[PDB]
Amino acid sequence: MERDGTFNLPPHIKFGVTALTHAANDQTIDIYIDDDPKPAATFKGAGAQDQNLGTKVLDSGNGRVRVIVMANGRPSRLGSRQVDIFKKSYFGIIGSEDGADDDYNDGIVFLNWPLG
Amino acid sequence: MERDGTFNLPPHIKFGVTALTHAANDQTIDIYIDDDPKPAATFKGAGAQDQNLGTKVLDSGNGRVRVIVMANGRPSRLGSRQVDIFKKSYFGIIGSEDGADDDYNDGIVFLNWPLG
């Protein structure tokens, strides 16, 4: 039931994407919407360990959202879950590992929807 | 399975707390460890500014962590969930709302542990 950072959101809504990086591996985090081959958003690499890289606000398009984490020119292995609070506040959580590392906490990406 | 912003973490570890706001009113988010009289961390957001208030690293103490959100002179309604990625990367999620009929997204707080 962990998936690979791919989510189905309600179509045509705003959502938030927040990245928190633990490992200082200068990761690139790309967010892709539907079948567009260019990322709708990209986080540049952390400049420090346990760094909050900020929040981006995006439109879900037709609803398909994929997060890809790259470190050292390879895709980091990912685990993702969805959860919601009272079927009102929805979350996607992605843990990534750049190693070696077996722990899925080198990088974290939080998705939240809807906004407001 | 929604609780009220209280969590049991592994005793004496570091963990992260990240806070986002999306509210009309100023909000104060307090994180309390065990029975400590003062908050271990406080995030304060400005009304009408949707803000990523950053990530703080805390010590879990004896393991009890409580999140309280105040807005408009009163405690917000809270819902919380826990989730993990491959039983390795752990998360606590809190959504808060001032208004009783809203979407538990005026305040969002994420807890993550362990670090590395």
Numbering used by the authors:
A (entry chain A), B (entry chain B): 0 to 115
The authors write:
A family of four soluble lectins has been identified in B. cenocepacia, all of them containing at least one domain with strong sequence similarity with LecB (PA-IIL) from Pseudomonas aeruginosa. BC2L-C has an N-terminal region of 155 amino acids (the TNF-α-like lectin), a 28-aa linker region, and a 115-aa C-terminal region. Since the isolated BC2L-C-nt domain binds strongly to fucose but not to mannose and galactose, BC2L-C is therefore a novel type of lectin consisting of independent fucose and mannose-binding domains. To our knowledge, BC2L-C is the first protein identified harbouring two different lectin domains with distinct specificity, for which we refer to it to as a “superlectin”.
